[PDB]
């Protein structure tokens, strides 16, 4: 097998078991990792579902490659303890992550400089008796707080709101959209899908700015 | 009135002047009197080709010209370079050929001219005047021991491009003449590289000067005054290039003019992409080649 | 790559864990009347089975040597480990199968898949008088 | 590609014209000419071969397999290869993970048509080899697959299909194949420049864009998965939502004409 | 479709699906036709013009004579082309030294045998190479033959193109054999294949059945008892289908091995199973289900209602099969089984003696006789035959033909005419073969 | 025990071929003009290969650079749909494959006039589509197209063919069914000569046949580079007759 | 990590072949002398040919077989180079080419060839079998590794013994080592590989269209010899005169008629060395048993 790790004897197996509008909620914390220059802590708990995750910043790191006019972002999603999302399922989100911050970050302030983003999908409850799609907007919030902690030039507190398998990311207090994500749902529910996302965005950004300006 | 060409063909991987045509591994002759040049290797008599190409016998010189290969750089040629890299006081820049050309630091037109003399602080500003991927007019000076050659801009006429659009072709169809900058009705100008690189732009006064400020030789600016009637006229000359390229046509400046007026059937400029219609206009000119000269 | 080795080494050299603590005493799920299931558990004592445990250490904001905190954080996790109740089927459907040779044949043994309970669990037995702690 | 800045203005100028202008000057809703070949890998359940105008090139293969449809959830698998790249790269894995979502088993896929018995069915393999691309290649790739499913025959059931009591091992005839009846989806690449929305972004058009979309077409309508999508990352701008609302019917009132051009046999 | 090579040579694709382990595995092959296909006979002068050496540098031997058995016109001189079925029915009739000296084997007929039976396929492989001066067998590779190759027609089963190609195979033959007036006789047993030539559909062709060929021999009396072939008190059951037993094997439902039927008790026998320790008895005449002793069969356990003390689902039977091993550890009430399929018959040629009750003295015609076998454990065989008054005080060779549903004792046919009962030479002979002793002299391929 | 018929006593193979016969052999030139200047397609029976060549051109890194000659990269793509049975895992570092990646390099270290292409890169791309056995010599014949397909400097044709041995008898142009049935040898044959580029034997071979066995494949191999030549030439005529 | 040799030194050896000389003192077609010595363990051996030194190790343990061949045991050979044996090498590069050139040979030389009965590793079918292991170590290179590792593995198989087994379903009784004896293994055939080493004294064309065969082939390239060679060829045979493998993977072009003429000379070489192993296996085991005679009479 893998000669680099301790994976036990091969013939063992893990243990098996069988059967015998609501509120979302946060707890947002910064400044707790001394390796980084930007850290952010996120608790989330909603109705069957409790979620905690860590966003980590390293920047500006040097680039051994070549010259660029401006900065470059690198984003990692890694499984924590229990929930195991698929590998190719991860990087699609990482693709969707980078597009929004490329309408956020003053890379032109940062020539030949790198951005390292480590996201640790650390622990999630789903006690409910598109499972990754329910965790998208909280990432952007978790990144933004850590990116404020490294103090990097950011245009807006941009945030995403969720309405039932749909993720829409805003700026300008919702007056423009910067990132769009849709799974199955209804048809032409878009206009209501504007709304419930927007107000959570209207909730969340206020929760964020409270976390920093009051500190 | 369409969106896309969707024509279907299912059940197949594919649809399925005399001179010496020789192969590699093949004997030409063993007359020792012949001289042995390009495309030729040998063992003391046995004249052996190395490519798919033609026997060229020049008066005692036998050599093999291939049919397929990259662009061959030669001196004094007027081509277009895309900026690959920056070196010590050197630059790397694609020809399209085998390798990059090189370009000395003082090989370029300085703003203010020669009154601006040398400075070691200029290598602290290599990226100032030039950076990657950019397009320009270049003059082929001389070579190295291999066959890699270098460039320069010994004129105002050579320099960094603007005011238009690039296209590219195989190097074969571009015909040689004593002139390469050409000016076309529509107030516009083709800059045919030899190597297969083609830049269009709006006719400048310096272009007009050819047939009757200096601090703008590294700008990313254009003329701000660019009409759509300029811009849409660019595209009509643009596709007819690829029409002749798809039709395997040697480029004549007049043929382009002949391509342009034959394209006046179609005002819908987006219809200039059709495999048949490009071939039809391609068929037009070859028939029109059988009248004049 | 050193760390997970180095712990495991002195965990062996701690002599914390007799394999008696890994001995699993499974039950059998009696298919009882009118379609109900109760797992007959034997108590206070044909195949045997053994737990094999795993750990994962995540390290955030490394500021120095880590090994002592690698040690000590495990120790409190060790005391919190419940052993979940494992049981086998009453009579599992997954039984002996035969494989034909080029004239001969053999028998695959019956595949009794152990199942841990959704509910019941017992704690872990520890040589508690050998639970160390670390210091550099 | 690496292009020059003086173009990049003019290219961003001309396409953001209010009488909007493509570099090839098509109408804003046009696509580019292509070629579509199938049915040429006779070891396969179906084959496909598609040719772009810039010479981007792919082939998608169809191999099937009989499976128990109860012990396995995913009845339909996509697996992609791009030439020239590592497995580990980004654009690989996202496009790979995408079409799985696009072909979820009951979202636009009619897995009842895949169903063999009350116990068994057909595992299929969407196996993809891209020779070359110069584009964000995705909407090309769906097109050959659409023809690939329209070029796929399957061997005929002989025996019965109720294996709960009798538990029969299913039997196929050795010559008689039947075409997979299926309604496969389609994917379209979009791009936003200024106040204009082009269709089939070529690589130059793909470079200069502020932002772009991917819209899932199925069953004669718009459906999920739908993703806003970056093409470059030097020119990423945000966007008014009615422009997002604009493009949907802008896709849709030209979508089936492309489909009917390919629904053409 | 098909394509052409520059040697005038054809190439096309034969493609199918491998059904092994229930899988659906599509298998494609290319296929070639050649135009150097030999007709392999004495009289033709043009197929010896095209014969080319092998890798061992040999041009082979064209052995079917100008002189067959000539018969009554419109037969005249003729060759014989066969059915697989007439071979499958009458494989030993072919091995008569007295007759059938010149037979083309078609390639498809060769394949169905190789599809059907492996050691029967040995015998045709044996006979063709061991053809002699007397008897001559060739194999014509007709679907390697360009001029006899056919395709799958639209809306067709594989059986149709089999009969059509064999019909196509014969069609080329007389065309090549018009110049010498040696005909070609197609022998069949299929009544629908004996229907399409009644109108003489395309070819003025010799479509006769076995007996319809047999009734034209000069010496047909000696051989018609080698032609293969109420009688009811109850009805015997049947054997399970293909998907049923292959569906039975993996689940642990079904079992195979060998069975021993007792002589002191003709109606009771046990098997030795790989999963099972003790010999598991099978009790009951219907439960033995018309198989013979020593054969490879496929068995099923019986419910405890039929177990012996000295449902729909297979969910029940497996849990009952566990209870068998409990009852195997009992040895007080032990389980019973019955057969549900026969893995293989251990049939061969068999030698016995007839019953004096079965024969009429005054009769000269065809009649039923039963053969008392030399094997004590195996039952008698109804033999519908003429010359029983001859053969009653004589030893005989039979071969078992079939077991249909009704017949309590099987249908078989007499094969070889041996000699007088308790004559020393004949009792020497069957003492060899029923003890499996080879005795036949060394053949023509041996002495080379 | 095989329930099938390997080689007839009547001299025939599975499709009816003789022991000294080939499959249908089809090449093509300039299959992908928009992709690279080397683009050639092979059908040798159902062995179907797309062959692609890039160069002579600049490296990605100055580390991977020489001031004497070219480099040669081999990238083999075996698809999971290449066979009947679909292979589970990918092959991209499989040690079986890397051997061939070594092999074609040293086979083609010595046709390329390496000195006259220094500081540049040759990359050879392989796409194995449909696999029919005889797989090794299938490749090399596709290579010999692709170098000429751009007209790279070389000495000679190079031919490749697997020839198998059923007990005494050589088999030109085996298939994978026959490959798993007996012992086979592939020969990398150079031009018109009797000198070898590739020689590879996996199966167990009695010694005494081998000289004769080697004496077989040359006539096949000479007919290979035969059929490559004119097929290029009739293409080669199609250029200038309609170019001019 | 690059070996640097002058072109002056390059011509020097190339001249020596042109006057039929080689630097070691052997003939062209002469092989080194082989020192085989066993350690105390079974499947323990040190093998030495002048400068090249190797060491390998055979072991076995209990595992289940695959689904693939559920009948048969498990076996594989490790050949991980350490840069101990020469500073050219990476720390355990399993992805280097020459490594693969060392690998696939020994893969085909042993595993696909099957000198060893893997079915005689079946303890119980599908439940418990053997996992037999072959770790090859290199010590110091003068070339001939792939011939040395050819030998030293096959040396090791004829010296390893496995212990005693008793089966009762799950009750699988591995006995104590010293009460119940270890049991050696079943070798179907003994393969010996041969390196061939090739030198064009000329250009390409006189090899290509120079019809005159003029190419020198030698056995067991030394280190300096090995760095200039033009083709690479290894054949492998037995005592029963069958050819195990041949591998000319490219390099220099090469006449066929040479290769048969080459491979015949392989035969007489390998046979004598083979029997030298065979006596020493006996003679050491004789020395084991004479010291076993020097033990029981002692004890």
Q: Are F189 and F196 in contact (CB under 8 A)?
A: yes
What are the φ and ψ backbone dihedral angles of A105, each rounded to 5 degrees?
-90, 135
User: Of the candidates G144, G114, G152, which has an alpha carbon nearest to the alpha carbon of residue G242?
Assistant: G114
Q: Which of E16, E38, E55 to mutate to test the interface with F (most CBs of F within 10 A)?
A: E55
For residue A199, give Cα distances in angstroms to A161, A170, A204, D44: 7, 11, 8, 52
| Domain coverage including residue G171 | 5-299
User: Of the candidates D196, D187, D199, D88, which has an alpha carbon nearest to the alpha carbon of residue D139?
Assistant: D187
**Structural tokens at position D30:** 């046009």
Instruction: Please tell me the distance from the alpha carbon of residue F108 to that of residue G267, in angstroms, as a whole number.
Output: 31
Q: What is the tally of structural domains in chain A?
A: 1
User: Of the candidates D43, D31, D68, which has an alpha carbon nearest to the alpha carbon of residue D167?
Assistant: D68
Q: Per the omega criterion (within 30 degrees of 0), is the bond before E231 cis?
A: no
Instruction: Using CB atoms, pick whichever of B41, B43, B48 lies closest to residue G210.
Output: B43
Cite the beta strand spans of E290-421 per DSSP E: 296-301, 337-344, 349-354, 367-373, 381-385, 394-402, 411-420
Interface touch B13/D29, C-beta < 8 Å = no
Which residue in the block uniquely carries the two structure tokens 């494992």?
Answer: C86
Interface touch D79/F80, C-beta < 8 Å = yes
Q: Which residues pair with D179 in a beta bridge?
A: D153
Instruction: Please tell me the distance from the alpha carbon of residue G114 to that of residue G108, in angstroms, as a whole number.
Output: 9
Instruction: Please tell me the distance from the alpha carbon of residue B209 to that of residue B207, in angstroms, as a whole number.
Output: 5
10 Å Cβ neighbour count for E88?
16
Residues 6+ apart with CB under 8 A from B291: none
The answer to whether chain D touches chain G by having 3 or more C-beta pairs less than 8 angstroms apart is: no
Instruction: Please tell me the distance from the alpha carbon of residue B22 to that of residue B29, in angstroms, as a whole number.
Output: 12
User: Of the candidates D31, D228, D63, which has an alpha carbon nearest to the alpha carbon of residue D153?
Assistant: D63
Residues 6+ apart with CB under 8 A from B261: none
- Whether D22 has its CB under 8 Å from any CB of chain B: the answer is yes
Q: Are A55 and A39 in contact (CB under 8 A)?
A: yes
Residues E142-164, buried b or exposed e (16+ Cβ, 10 A)? bbbbbebbeeeeeeeeeeebbbb
What are the φ and ψ backbone dihedral angles of A66, each rounded to 5 degrees?
-165, -170
User: Of the candidates A174, A158, A163, which has an alpha carbon nearest to the alpha carbon of residue A209?
Assistant: A158
Chains that touch B (3 or more CB pairs under 8 A): D, F, G
CA-nearest residue to A102 within chain D is D236
Instruction: Please tell me the distance from the alpha carbon of residue E115 to that of residue E88, in angstroms, as a whole number.
Output: 12
Cite the beta strand spans of B162-286 per DSSP E: 164-168, 181-184, 188-192, 197-202
Residues B201-216, buried b or exposed e (16+ Cβ, 10 A)? bbbeeebeeeeeeeee
Q: Which of C28, C92, C95, C106 to mutate to test the interface with E (most CBs of E within 10 A)?
A: C95
CA-nearest residue to D13 within chain B is B226
- Give me the residues of D, 216-245, that contact A with CB < 8 A: 221-230, 233-234, 236-241, 244-245
Q: Are B76 and B139 in contact (CB under 8 A)?
A: yes
Interface touch F196/G237, C-beta < 8 Å = no
**Residue A94, domain CATH:** 3.30.230.70
Instruction: Please tell me the distance from the alpha carbon of residue G165 to that of residue G183, in angstroms, as a whole number.
Output: 10
DSSP state of D72: -
Residue E297 region by backbone torsions, left for phi larger than 0, else alpha for psi between -120 and 50, else beta: beta
Dihedral, CA atoms, A82, A86, A89, A90, nearest 10 degrees?
50
Chain B: closest CA distance from residue F114 (Å)? 13
Instruction: Using CB atoms, pick whichever of C8, C114, C119 lies closest to residue A20.
Output: C119
- Helices C67-79, C2-14: inter-axial angle, 10-degree rounding: 50
Q: Length of chain F in residues, anyone? A: 244
> What SS3 state is found at D87?
coil
Instruction: Using CB atoms, pick whichever of G104, G250, G255 lies closest to residue F105.
Output: G250
Instruction: Please tell me the distance from the alpha carbon of residue D96 to that of residue A181, in angstroms, as a whole number.
Output: 17
DSSP state of D193: E
List the determination method.
Answer: cryo-EM
Instruction: Please tell me the distance from the alpha carbon of residue D149 to that of residue G107, in angstroms, as a whole number.
Output: 42
| Domain coverage including residue A10 | 5-215
Instruction: Please tell me the distance from the alpha carbon of residue A162 to that of residue G239, in angstroms, as a whole number.
Output: 76
> What SS3 state is found at E19?
coil
Q: Which of D67, D154, D175, D180 to mutate to test the interface with E (most CBs of E within 10 A)?
A: D175
Taking every pair of Cα atoms in chain F, the longest distance, rounded to a whole number of angstroms, is 62
User: Of the candidates A208, A178, A206, which has an alpha carbon nearest to the alpha carbon of residue A98?
Assistant: A178
Interface touch E318/C97, C-beta < 8 Å = no
The answer to whether chain D touches chain B by having 3 or more C-beta pairs less than 8 angstroms apart is: yes
Instruction: Using CB atoms, pick whichever of A94, A179, A184 lies closest to residue D224.
Output: A184
Q: Are A165 and A184 in contact (CB under 8 A)?
A: yes
> What SS3 state is found at G130?
strand
Interface touch F192/B25, C-beta < 8 Å = yes
Instruction: Please tell me the distance from the alpha carbon of residue G67 to that of residue E398, in angstroms, as a whole number.
Output: 47
Q: Per the omega criterion (within 30 degrees of 0), is the bond before A60 cis?
A: yes
Beta carbon pairs, D and E, within 8 Å: 52
Instruction: Using CB atoms, pick whichever of E252, E274, E318 lies closest to residue C105.
Output: E274
Give 3-state DSSP helix, strand, coil % of chain E, rounded to 5: 25, 25, 50
User: Of the candidates A138, A127, A143, which has an alpha carbon nearest to the alpha carbon of residue A167?
Assistant: A138
**Structural tokens at position B146:** 């291999």
Instruction: Please tell me the distance from the alpha carbon of residue G232 to that of residue E200, in angstroms, as a whole number.
Output: 70
Q: What is the tally of structural domains in chain G?
A: 1
Instruction: Please tell me the distance from the alpha carbon of residue E123 to that of residue E113, in angstroms, as a whole number.
Output: 10
Cα-to-chain-centroid distance, residue E375: 22
> What SS3 state is found at B69?
coil
Dihedral, CA atoms, B87, B89, B92, B95, nearest 10 degrees?
-170
Instruction: Using CB atoms, pick whichever of F58, F113, F155 lies closest to residue B100.
Output: F58
**Structural tokens at position E446:** 């041996």
H-type alpha helices, E257-372: 285-288, 314-330
Q: Are E293 and E259 in contact (CB under 8 A)?
A: yes
Instruction: Please tell me the distance from the alpha carbon of residue F184 to that of residue F199, in angstroms, as a whole number.
Output: 11
Instruction: Please tell me the distance from the alpha carbon of residue D137 to that of residue D189, in angstroms, as a whole number.
Output: 9
Beta carbon pairs, B and G, within 8 Å: 9
What are the φ and ψ backbone dihedral angles of C13, each rounded to 5 degrees?
-85, -5
Residue A50 region by backbone torsions, left for phi larger than 0, else alpha for psi between -120 and 50, else beta: beta
For residue C5, give Cα distances in angstroms to A7, E191, E224, F16: 11, 81, 86, 64
Chain F: closest CA distance from residue B30 (Å)? 17
Interface touch E275/C96, C-beta < 8 Å = yes
User: Of the candidates C50, C53, C21, which has an alpha carbon nearest to the alpha carbon of residue C127?
Assistant: C21
- Whether G71 has its CB under 8 Å from any CB of chain C: the answer is yes
Dihedral, CA atoms, E155, E157, E159, E164, nearest 10 degrees?
20
Q: Which of D56, D129, D148 to mutate to test the interface with F (most CBs of F within 10 A)?
A: D129
10 Å Cβ neighbour count for F36?
19
The answer to whether chain A touches chain F by having 3 or more C-beta pairs less than 8 angstroms apart is: no
H-type alpha helices, chain D: 5-15, 90-102, 111-114, 138-149, 203-207, 241-252, 255-263
3-state secondary structure C53-111: CCCCCCCCCCCCCCHHHHHHHHHHHHHCCCEEEEEEECCCCCCCEEEECCCCEEEECCC
Interface touch A20/C37, C-beta < 8 Å = yes
Instruction: Please tell me the distance from the alpha carbon of residue F21 to that of residue E56, in angstroms, as a whole number.
Output: 15
10 Å Cβ neighbour count for E18?
14
Instruction: Please tell me the distance from the alpha carbon of residue A130 to that of residue D226, in angstroms, as a whole number.
Output: 13
Strand-strand pairing, F183-190 and F158-166: antiparallel
Q: Are D162 and D118 in contact (CB under 8 A)?
A: yes
Q: How far apart are the first and last CA of chain B?
A: 37
CA-nearest residue to C104 within chain E is E274
Instruction: Please tell me the distance from the alpha carbon of residue D211 to that of residue D244, in angstroms, as a whole number.
Output: 11
Instruction: Using CB atoms, pick whichever of C91, C97, C106 lies closest to residue E319.
Output: C91
Chains that touch A (3 or more CB pairs under 8 A): C, D
Interface touch F214/G101, C-beta < 8 Å = no
User: Half-sphere exposure (CA, 13 Å, Cβ side) for D96?
Assistant: 22
Which residue in the block uniquely carries the two structure tokens 């910067």?
Answer: A178
**Residue G85, domain CATH:** 3.30.230.70
For residue G117, give Cα distances in angstroms to B231, C101, C105, D106, G130: 78, 16, 19, 51, 12
Instruction: Please tell me the distance from the alpha carbon of residue C53 to that of residue C77, in angstroms, as a whole number.
Output: 12
Residues 6+ apart with CB under 8 A from D233: A73, A98, A99, A102
How open is the CA angle E389-E390-E396, to the nearest 5 degrees? 110
Instruction: Please tell me the distance from the alpha carbon of residue E351 to that of residue E344, in angstroms, as a whole number.
Output: 21
Which residue in the block uniquely carries the two structure tokens 């084997």?
Answer: E105
Interface touch D79/F86, C-beta < 8 Å = no
Q: Per the omega criterion (within 30 degrees of 0), is the bond before G116 cis?
A: no
DSSP state of G109: I
- Whether D213 has its CB under 8 Å from any CB of chain A: the answer is yes
Q: Are A97 and A115 in contact (CB under 8 A)?
A: no
Cite the beta strand spans of chain D per DSSP E: 35-38, 48-51, 57-68, 76-82, 120-132, 153-157, 172-179, 186-193, 196-199, 212-218, 221-229
Residues 6+ apart with CB under 8 A from B232: B269, D21, D25
Chains that touch F (3 or more CB pairs under 8 A): B, D, E, G
Q: Length of chain A in residues, anyone? A: 215
Instruction: Please tell me the distance from the alpha carbon of residue A187 to that of residue B116, in angstroms, as a whole number.
Output: 68
Instruction: Please tell me the distance from the alpha carbon of residue A176 to that of residue A178, in angstroms, as a whole number.
Output: 7
Interface touch D166/E28, C-beta < 8 Å = no
Using an 8 Å CB-CB cutoff, list chain D residues near E111.
none
**Structural tokens at position B180:** 């390469």
- Give me the residues of F, 6-25, that contact E with CB < 8 A: 8-12, 14-17, 19-20, 23-24
User: Of the candidates A194, A109, A206, which has an alpha carbon nearest to the alpha carbon of residue A155?
Assistant: A109
Q: Length of chain E in residues, anyone? A: 448
User: Half-sphere exposure (CA, 13 Å, Cβ side) for B176?
Assistant: 4
Instruction: Please tell me the distance from the alpha carbon of residue C5 to that of residue D39, in angstroms, as a whole number.
Output: 56
């Amino acid at each position: 097998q893998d000669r680099r790790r301790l994976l036990g004897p091969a013939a063992a197996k893990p243990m098996a078991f069988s059967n015998t509008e609501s509120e979302q909620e946060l707890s947002l914390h910064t400044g707790f990792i001394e390796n980084c220059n930007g850290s952010a802590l996120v608790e989330a708990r909603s109705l069957g579902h409790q979620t905690s995750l860590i966003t980590a910043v390293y920047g500006p790191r040097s680039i051994r490659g070549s010259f660029t006019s401006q900065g470059t972002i690198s984003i990692q999603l890694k499984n924590g303890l229990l929930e195991k999302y698929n590998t190719n399922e991860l990087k699609e989100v990482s693709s969707f992550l980078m597009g929004i911050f490329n309408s956020v970050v003053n890379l032109s302030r940062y020539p030949k400089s790198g951005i390292d983003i480590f996201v640790y999908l650390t622990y999630d409850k789903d006690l409910t008796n598109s499972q990754i799609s329910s965790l998208i907007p909280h990432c952007i919030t978790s990144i933004t707080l850590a990116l404020a902690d490294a103090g990097i030039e950011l245009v807006d507190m941009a945030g995403a709101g969720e309405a039932n398998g749909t993720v829409v990311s805003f700026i300008k207090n919702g007056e423009e959209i910067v990132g769009f994500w849709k799974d199955d749902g209804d048809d032409e529910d878009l206009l209501e899908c504007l709304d419930r996302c927007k107000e959570q965005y209207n909730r969340y950004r206020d929760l964020m700015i409270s976390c920093l300006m009051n500190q | 009135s369409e969106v896309i060409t969707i024509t279907k063909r299912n059940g197949a991987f594919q649809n399925s002047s005399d001179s010496q045509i020789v192969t590699p591994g093949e004997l030409v002759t063993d007359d020792p009197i012949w001289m042995r040049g390009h495309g030729t290797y040998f063992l003391d008599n046995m004249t052996y080709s190395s490519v798919a190409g033609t026997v060229s016998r020049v008066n005692r010189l036998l050599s093999v010209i291939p049919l397929k290969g990259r662009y061959a750089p030669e001196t004094g040629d007027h081509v277009v370079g895309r900026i690959a890299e920056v070196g010590n006081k050197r630059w790397k820049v694609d020809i399209g050929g085998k390798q990059h050309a090189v370009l000395m630091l003082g090989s370029v037109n300085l703003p203010g001219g020669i009154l601006r003399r040398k400075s070691e602080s200029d290598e602290l500003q290599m990226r100032s005047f030039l950076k990657e991927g950019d397009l320009l007019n270049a003059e082929v000076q001389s070579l190295f021991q291999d066959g890699s050659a270098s460039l320069h801009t010994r004129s105002l006429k050579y320099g960094k491009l603007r005011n238009g659009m690039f296209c590219q072709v195989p190097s074969s169809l571009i015909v040689r003449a004593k002139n390469h900058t050409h000016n076309l009705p529509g107030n516009i100008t083709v800059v045919l590289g030899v190597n297969g690189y083609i830049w269009l732009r709006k006719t400048s006064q310096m272009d007009l000067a050819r047939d009757t400020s200096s601090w703008q030789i590294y700008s990313d600016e254009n003329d701000p005054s660019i009409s759509n009637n300029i811009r849409q006229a660019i595209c009509r000359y643009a596709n007819v290039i690829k029409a002749l390229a798809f039709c395997e046509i040697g480029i004549t400046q007049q043929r382009i003019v002949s391509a342009y007026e034959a394209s006046m059937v179609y005002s819908n400029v987006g219809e200039l992409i059709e495999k048949n219609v490009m071939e039809s206009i391609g068929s037009d000119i070859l028939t029109a080649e059988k009248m004049r000269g | 790559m050193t760390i997970s080795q180095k712990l495991h080494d002195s965990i062996l050299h701690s002599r914390i864990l007799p394999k008696k603590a890994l001995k699993v005493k499974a039950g059998v799920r009696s298919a009882n009347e009118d379609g109900t299931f109760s797992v007959l558990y034997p108590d206070e004592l044909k195949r045997k089975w053994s737990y094999v445990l795993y750990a994962k250490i995540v390290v955030l904001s490394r500021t120095g040597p880590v090994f002592d905190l690698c040690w000590n954080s495990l120790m409190y996790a060790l005391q919190s480990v419940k052993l979940p109740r494992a049981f086998i089927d009453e009579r599992a459907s997954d039984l002996r199968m035969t494989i034909r040779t080029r004239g001969r044949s053999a028998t695959i043994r019956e595949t009794y898949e152990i199942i841990c309970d959704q509910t019941k669990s017992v704690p872990l037995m520890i040589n508690a008088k050998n639970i160390a702690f670390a210091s550099n | 590609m690496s292009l020059s800045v003086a173009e990049k203005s003019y290219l961003y100028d001309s396409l953001a014209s209010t009488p909007s202008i493509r570099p090839d000057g098509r109408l804003p809703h046009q696509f580019r000419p292509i070629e579509i070949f199938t049915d040429f890998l006779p070891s396969s359940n179906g084959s496909s071969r598609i040719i772009a105008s810039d010479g981007s090139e792919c082939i998608v293969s169809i191999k099937s397999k009989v499976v128990d449809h109860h012990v396995e959830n995913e009845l339909l698998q996509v697996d992609v290869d791009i030439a020239g790249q590592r497995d580990d790269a980004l654009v690989v894995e996202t496009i790979t993970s995408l079409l799985n979502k696009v072909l979820k088993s009951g979202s636009g896929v009619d897995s009842s048509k895949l169903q063999l018995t009350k116990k068994y069915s057909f595992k299929i393999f969407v196996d993809v080899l891209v020779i070359s691309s110069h584009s964000h290649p995705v909407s090309l790739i769906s097109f050959a697959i659409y023809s690939a499913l329209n070029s796929t025959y399957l061997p005929k059931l002989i025996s019965a299909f109720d294996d709960l009591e009798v538990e029969e091992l299913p039997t196929f005839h050795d010559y008689d194949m039947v075409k997979l009846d299926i309604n496969p989806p389609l994917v379209f690449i979009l791009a936003v420049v200024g106040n204009n929305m082009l269709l089939d972004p070529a690589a130059n058009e793909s470079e200069v864009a502020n932002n772009g979309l991917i819209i899932s077409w199925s069953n004669g309508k718009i459906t999920s998965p739908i993703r806003s999508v970056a093409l470059n990352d030097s020119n990423v701008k945000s966007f008014k939502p009615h422009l997002l609302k604009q493009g949907l019917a802008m896709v849709e009132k030209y979508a089936p004409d492309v489909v009917r051009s390919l629904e053409n046999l | 479709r098909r394509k052409r090579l520059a040697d005038g040579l054809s190439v096309t694709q034969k493609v199918f699906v491998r059904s092994r382990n229930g899988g659906a595995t599509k298998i494609v092959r290319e296929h070639y036709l050649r135009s150097d296909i030999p007709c392999l006979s004495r009289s033709c002068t043009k197929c010896p013009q095209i014969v080319v050496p092998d890798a061992q540098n040999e041009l082979p031997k064209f052995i079917l004579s100008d002189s067959p058995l000539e018969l009554s016109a419109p037969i005249g001189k003729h060759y014989v082309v066969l059915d697989t079925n007439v071979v499958l029915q009458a494989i030993d009739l072919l091995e008569n030294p007295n007759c059938f000296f010149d037979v083309i084997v078609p390639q498809i007929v060769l394949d169905e045998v190789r599809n059907k039976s492996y050691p029967v396929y040995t015998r045709l492989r044996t006979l063709c190479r061991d053809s002699d001066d007397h008897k001559r067998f060739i194999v014509f590779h007709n679907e390697f033959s360009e001029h006899t190759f056919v395709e799958r027609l639209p809306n067709e089963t594989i059986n149709d193109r089999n009969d059509r190609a064999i019909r196509k195979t014969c069609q080329w033959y007389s065309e090549h054999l018009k110049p010498y007036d040696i005909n070609v006789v197609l022998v069949t047993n299929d009544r629908l294949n004996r229907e399409a030539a009644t109108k003489e559909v395309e070819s003025n062709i010799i479509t006769k059945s076995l007996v319809q060929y047999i009734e034209l021999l000069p010496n047909a009396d000696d051989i018609r008892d080698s032609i293969p072939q109420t009688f009811s008190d109850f009805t015997f059951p049947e054997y399970y289908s293909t998907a049923r037993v292959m569906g039975g094997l993996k689940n642990g439902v079904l079992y195979q091995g060998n069975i021993q039927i007792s002589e002191y008790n003709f109606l009771e026998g046990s098997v030795s199973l790989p999963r099972f320790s003790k010999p598991v008895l099978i009790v009951g005449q219907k439960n033995l289900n018309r198989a013979f002793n020593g054969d490879q069969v496929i068995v099923e356990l019986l419910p405890q209602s039929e177990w012996k003390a000295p449902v729909i689902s297979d969910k029940q039977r497996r849990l009952l099969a566990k209870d068998a091993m409990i009852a195997q550890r009992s040895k007080k009430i032990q389980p019973t089984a019955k057969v549900v399929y026969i893995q293989r018959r251990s049939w061969r040629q068999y030698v016995g003696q007839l019953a004096p009750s079965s024969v009429d003295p005054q009769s000269s015609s065809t009649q039923n006789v039963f053969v008392i076998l030399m094997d004590k454990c195996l039952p008698k065989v109804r033999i519908r035959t003429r010359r029983a008054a001859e053969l009653l005080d004589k030893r005989i060779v039979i071969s078992i033909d079939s077991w249909p549903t009704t017949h309590k004792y099987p249908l078989g046919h007499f094969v070889r005419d041996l000699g007088t009962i308790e004559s020393a030479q004949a009792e020497t002979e069957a003492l060899l073969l029923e003890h499996d002793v080879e005795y036949r002299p060394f053949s023509k391929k041996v002495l080379e | 025990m095989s329930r099938l018929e390997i080689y007839s006593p009547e001299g025939l193979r599975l499709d009816g071929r003789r022991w000294n016969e080939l499959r249908r052999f089809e090449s093509s030139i300039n299959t992908h003009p928009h992709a690279a200047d080397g683009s050639s397609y092979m059908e040798q029976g159902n062995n179907k290969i797309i062959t692609l060549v890039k160069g002579p051109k600049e490296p990605r890194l100055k580390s991977q650079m020489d001031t004497s000659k070219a480099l040669l990269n081999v990238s083999v793509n075996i698809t999971k749909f290449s066979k009947f049975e679909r292979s589970k895992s990918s092959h991209k570092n499989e040690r079986r494959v890397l051997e061939i990646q070594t092999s074609l390099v040293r086979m083609f270290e010595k046709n390329v006039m390496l000195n006259i292409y220094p500081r540049t890169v040759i990359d050879i791309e392989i796409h194995v589509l449909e696999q029919d056995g005889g797989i090794m010599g299938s490749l090399i014949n596709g290579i010999t197209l692709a170098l000429i397909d751009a007209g790279i400097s070389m000495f000679d044709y190079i031919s490749g063919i697997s020839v198998g041995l059923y007990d005494t008898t050589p088999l030109l142009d085996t298939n994978s069914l026959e490959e798993n049935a007996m012992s086979t040898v592939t020969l990398g044959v150079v031009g018109k000569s009797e000198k070898l580029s590739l020689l590879l034997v996996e199966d167990k071979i009695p010694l005494d046949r081998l000289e004769n066995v080697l004496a077989i494949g040359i006539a096949g191999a000479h007919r290979v580079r035969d059929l490559m030549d004119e097929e290029l030439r009739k293409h080669a005529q199609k250029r200038v007759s309609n170019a001019s | 990590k690059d070996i640097e040799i002058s072109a002056s030194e390059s011509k020097f050896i190339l001249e020596a072949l042109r006057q039929n000389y080689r630097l070691d003192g052997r003939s062209f077609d002469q092989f080194r002398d082989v020192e085989i010595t066993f350690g105390k363990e079974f499947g323990d051996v040190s093998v030495k040919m002048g400068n090249t030194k190797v060491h390998c190790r055979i072991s076995c343990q209990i595992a289940q077989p695959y689904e693939d061949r559920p009948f048969e045991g498990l076996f594989v050979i490790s050949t991980e180079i350490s840069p101990m044996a020469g500073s050219q090498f990476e720390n355990g590069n399993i992805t280097g080419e020459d490594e693969v050139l060392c690998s696939r040979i020994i893969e085909k030389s042993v595993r696909r060839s099957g000198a060893l009965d893997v079915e005689g590793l079946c303890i119980v079918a599908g439940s418990k079998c053997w996992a037999v292991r072959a770790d090859v170590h290199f010590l110091d290179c003068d070339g001939g590794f792939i011939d040395a590792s050819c030998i030293a593995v096959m040396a090791g198989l004829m010296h390893f013994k496995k212990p005693d087994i008793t089966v009762h379903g799950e009750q699988i009784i591995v006995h104590p080592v010293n009460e119940r004896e270890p049991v050696p293994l079943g070798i179907l055939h003994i393969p010996i590989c041969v390196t061939f080493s090739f030198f064009n004294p000329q250009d390409t064309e006189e090899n290509i269209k120079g019809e005159t065969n003029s190419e020198i082939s030698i056995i067991d390239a030394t280190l300096k010899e090995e760095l200039l060679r033009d083709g690479v060829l290894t054949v492998t045979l037995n005592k029963n005169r069958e050819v195990v493998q041949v591998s000319k993977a490219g390099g220099l072009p090469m006449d066929a008629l040479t290769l048969m003429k080459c491979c015949h000379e392989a035969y007489s070489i390998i046979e004598k060395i083979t029997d030298q192993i065979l006596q020493l296996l006996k003679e050491d085991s004789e020395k084991r048993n004479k010291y076993a005679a020097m033990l029981t009479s002692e004890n």
